[PDB]
Every structure is written in structure tokens, then in C-alpha cells.
Symmetry: D2
């Protein structure tokens, strides 16, 4: 299994910044607003799993549709938040992976 090669994280940051700036929403995207929107989307992701004990690759296409959306909503707000904080998220993830290799040899 693997992801498609695109959109990348930068693609996602650009599409969302453009989406938001065309609608004059950037004035609502203070960090703590985006962090709570993230929390709320993580909450909608959790509602999909809450009555489903470990035993999603076998869910129906329809309930995998709801899962794709909620995973996407989390990612979009996470990218918005990181960008609002001037954090280069793909490089931060390489720095974190490097730390993890050294901590767990």
C-alpha cells in the first residue's frame, strides 16, 4: 500500500491559503482558533471509531468515505495551524524522524 504522489503538503498549504483568502477567512485563523478547529475535527474522526473495537480496510466504501473526509479535515487544519505559526512542517517531520532513530536505536 501507498499514497498518491500529489498533493504534497505544500500543495495543501497553498490550496487552503488561497481558499481562505478568497473568502476573507484569514482574519479568523488565529492559532488558538485553528487549534480548537483541529480538536473538533479530531472529535469527528473519533466518533467514527467509538463503537468499533479493533478486529477500516474492511469497512464499506460509504463509511470509508466518511473516514476519508474526517482524516482530510484533520490534515487541513493541522497544515493551516502549522503555516499560521510559520513552521515548515515537512522539515519539522524530518527533524522528528531523525530524533526518533537516535532515541530508539
Amino acid at each position: 500500500f501507498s499514497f498518491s504522489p500529489e498533493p504534497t503538503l505544500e500543495d495543501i498549504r497553498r490550496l487552503h491559503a488561497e481558499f481562505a483568502a478568497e473568502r476573507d477567512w484569514e482574519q479568523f485563523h488565529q492559532p488558538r482558533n485553528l487549534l480548537l478547529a483541529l480538536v473538533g475535527e479530531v472529535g469527528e474522526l473519533a466518533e467514527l471509531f467509538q463503537w468499533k473495537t479493533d478486529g477500516p480496510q474492511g469497512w464499506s466504501p460509504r463509511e470509508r468515505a466518511a473516514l476519508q473526509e474526517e482524516l482530510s479535515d484533520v490534515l487541513i487544519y493541522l497544515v493551516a495551524l502549522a503555516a499560521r505559526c510559520r513552521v515548515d512542517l515537512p522539515l519539522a517531520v524530518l527533524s522528528k524522524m531523525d530524533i526518533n532513530r537516535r532515541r530508539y536505536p
Copy 2:
């Protein structure tokens, strides 16, 4: 302001699965474990912000170090979760954005 072009979401998925297999951690990466690890990291992000009543850009280097690392972990667990579910996260994001444009 922008992000660097690499690693990609698929880059991240790969690095972390190899990292996890090499340590026989796959066995702990059932969907709901990864969902709850994601929740734990979002909480660590909230603890950074909880008493910042009403600017990350001009935060101290230690706080910016904490922010970068927690945002990274959220993204890693999110990618790993989506892979464990066999969801193509980049295309799903693109579908969602269309939904978002149709809704607004």
C-alpha cells in the same frame, strides 16, 4: 511564507512504516491505538496554548521547539493512521477541498 517541497505525505508514510517494522512496532499500530496516540499529541499541543490568553511567530526558542515537534507527531500519527486504514490521504484531501468549495 511556504513549506519545503519534501518529504511528501508518501515519503512520510514510508519512513515511518520502515521505522516501525524495523522495531516490530507494527503490532501496536492498530487503527484505534494510532487514533488515541493522535489524540494524546493534540492534547500536548493544547497544553502549549492553554494559558496563552488571546503570537507563536515570536515565541521563545524552547516553545517553538516544542511546537514544531508536537505538530510533527500529530502529522506522523495521522499519516500512519490513514495508511493503516488503507486511505489515500492526498487524494482524499483533494476530494474534501472540492466539497469545501461546493459548500462555500
Copy 3:
């Protein structure tokens, strides 16, 4: 006078009420700890959705719209119900655990 909670239901009352609600529907079989935990997370997220675009500033939640206030009451209530259920399902005596946490907090912040 100054603001107060009502005296009932207590935490034990809520545990009983919720257990009866589940028993009436045959739902206890779905109330494994990790199920209730993720249910709590979903409700915490619905609470966050009420506040996400609302910057802090008096008057605050007390000056919200009637339906916004109703949604706040229902969301705070939902978090509490699943917390009680989770604690009960883990065999945690929540009222006494609170007393014990308040002593921990007094030592940490003398």
C-alpha cells in the same frame, strides 16, 4: 447571591441514571472502556466546535445566543456523562479520586 450549582444529581446519581438508560436499551455491551473514552473525545470535540471562532472577551459564553447556550449546556453535559461512564467502567470512585487529586494539587502548588 453568587453563582452555584444545583445539589443533585450528584456523580453517583449520574452513574445510576446513565446505567439505567443503557440497561433500558441493552447497550452496556458496547460500553468497553476504550469505546467510552473515544465517545468522550468526540464530545470534547463538539464542545471545542462551539468555541473555535469565538475569541475570548467579555461578556463571553454568558452573552451567547439562546441556541448557542443550549448547545454549550448539552455539550458540557455530554462530556460529563461519558466521563462518569468511563470512570464507572474502570472501577474508579470518581468523587474520592477528586479529593485525592485536590490534595496532590495542594502539595504541588502550596
Copy 4:
């Protein structure tokens, strides 16, 4: 299994309000501050469970952590309800009525 009869929710609110007043902390207890701190405590609870594909069979130290994090979540939920002037025990009764109509 049952809960002890005390402290009630009103007891918890008073104890925490006096604890906060004594330390001059009520100035930091804006609603979104308390909400984010609640989110943080929920994350710590998530962490006790994340790698656990039963709580009663957990070690005494893990059960101690579980008691403490459940209690933290409850104190911040209480603090937030009060800061919002929500009579939390009565709201619960209304909520149970709502649930009975949603699920006849």
C-alpha cells in the same frame, strides 16, 4: 460498583474556586483557557489507553495515573461550566431527557 456519595459537583466547584482564589488564579481562567486545559487532560487520559489494544488488570501505578487524569478532566470541566454560568447538574438532567427522545 458505585461511587461514594461526596463530594458532589457543587462541592467540587467550591473546592476548586477557593483553591484558585487563594492563589489569585481566577484571572487566568477564561473559558477558552479552561477548555484547552481540559483538552490537554483528555489527551493525557488518551495516552494511558493508546497502546492498550482491561483497566482493572493494570498495575497500581497505571491505576493511580488513571484516577488522577479522570479527576483532572472533571475539575477543568467543572471549572469551565462554572465560568460559563452553566448549572451543570441540571443541564445533565435536561440532556438525559434529550437522549431519551433521541433514542426512544
